[PDB]
Design a protein around this ligand. Structure first.
Ligand SMILES: [Ca+2]
Ligand SMILES: [Ca+2]
Ligand SMILES: [Ca+2]
Ligand SMILES: [Zn+2]
Ligand SMILES: [Zn+2]
Length: 161
């Protein structure tokens, strides 16, 4: 009934950056976001620096060339497409927002990314208020995956070796 990736080897590339954080910190917040899923499944993520990747990462504001617009400060935060060719799997983040690692003021890039990557793997929203896949953003200092999230991703790719 649902679409998923054919093999467990997926590539990704950060083709656009934001002015709000150091490039090395951005690369780290994105890798940490992928690991939350690879720790409970057989999935493997490899970063490439040339050519097109399975999951293209980017930033944008308002219409950015895909029919699905953003909306300035606050409101929508980001979005991702289901497993598919071409644009499928791509994750876009709104740059009218202030990205940080939570706290002071802004939205945690690590938290929003972990959520969008669940989409790129084939997950939908969850009715569980405490789930990472819930539709609303909530900041928490000590993050941990809920049973609901673990149960859904393992249903699609199996459990961790
Ligand atoms: Ca917005
Ligand atoms: Ca893609
Ligand atoms: Ca910004
Ligand atoms: Zn987009
Ligand atoms: Zn979502």
């Amino acid at each position: 009934r649902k679409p998923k990736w054919d093999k467990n080897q997926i590539t990704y590339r950060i083709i656009g950056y934001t002015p709000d954080l150091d490039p090395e910190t951005v690369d780290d917040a994105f890798a940490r976001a992928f690991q939350v899923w690879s720790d409970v499944t057989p999935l493997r993520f490899s970063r490439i620096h040339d050519g097109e990747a399975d999951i293209m990462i980017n930033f944008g504001r308002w219409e950015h060339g895909d029919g699905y617009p953003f909306d300035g400060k606050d409101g929508l935060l980001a979005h991702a497409f289901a497993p598919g060719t071409g644009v499928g799997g791509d994750s876009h983040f709104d740059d009218d927002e202030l990205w940080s690692l939570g706290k002071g003021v802004g939205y945690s890039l690590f938290l929003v990314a972990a959520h969008e990557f669940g989409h790129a793997m084939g997950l939908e929203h969850s009715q569980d208020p405490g789930a990472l896949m819930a539709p609303i953003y909530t900041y928490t200092k000590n993050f941990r995956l809920s049973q609901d999230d673990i149960k859904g991703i393992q249903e699609l790719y199996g459990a961790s070796p």
